[PDB]
């Protein structure tokens, strides 16, 4: 319906899940898919493979604009940091730049207590 050809893959990779969002340079959301909503729950949801099909499913709800180049923004420590990026590149995508944007406070907010499991 419209045209971009130049995008950015923001991947949010937490421990429990990994959300993939495709966007233009402006930061406007073009398409998105998550692992948790691609048929993966709990123990399987938090896997690199689930992040992979997330990246794959996302490349199908965006090529309506015919993106052809993009940059990658890796946020968080979970799986699908890396495997998500791979799936994008195999789905027919030229990777321009890779950047980690995981936030690091300069020691500000006190985090939750340690879990005594």
């Amino acid at each position: 319906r419209k045209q971009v050809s130049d995008g950015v893959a923001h991947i949010h990779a937490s421990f429990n899940n990994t959300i993939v969002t495709i966007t233009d340079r402006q930061g406007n959301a073009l398409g998105w898919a998550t692992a948790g909503g691609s048929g993966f729950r709990g123990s399987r949801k938090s896997t690199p493979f689930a992040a992979q099909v997330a990246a794959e499913r996302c490349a199908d709800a965006v090529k309506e604009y015919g993106i052809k180049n993009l940059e990658v923004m890796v946020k968080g420590p979970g799986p699908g940091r890396e495997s998500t990026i791979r799936a994008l590149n195999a789905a027919g995508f030229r990777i321009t730049n890779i950047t980690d944007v995981t936030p690091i406070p300069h020691n500000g907010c006190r985090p939750p207590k340690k879990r005594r499991v």
Binding site: P77, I95, N97, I98, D100, T102, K113
Partner: protein, 56 residues
């Protein structure tokens, strides 16, 4: 750790670079460190212990 792929460099090599930039930068270590509160007494305890192990 910002990375920019150079021409006729495979997606893989650039990636391996990126992962080593983060290995170099200490991102995941850093995120692990802050997931949970550590008491001051505890991090002082950690600090002595590693000083000690860092004698061979």
């Amino acid at each position: 750790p910002v990375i920019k792929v150079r021409e006729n460099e495979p997606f893989d090599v650039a990636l391996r670079r990126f992962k080593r930039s983060c290995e170099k930068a200490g991102v995941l270590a850093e995120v692990r460190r802050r997931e949970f509160y550590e008491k001051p007494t505890t991090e002082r305890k950690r600090a002595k212990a590693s000083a000690v192990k860092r004698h061979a």
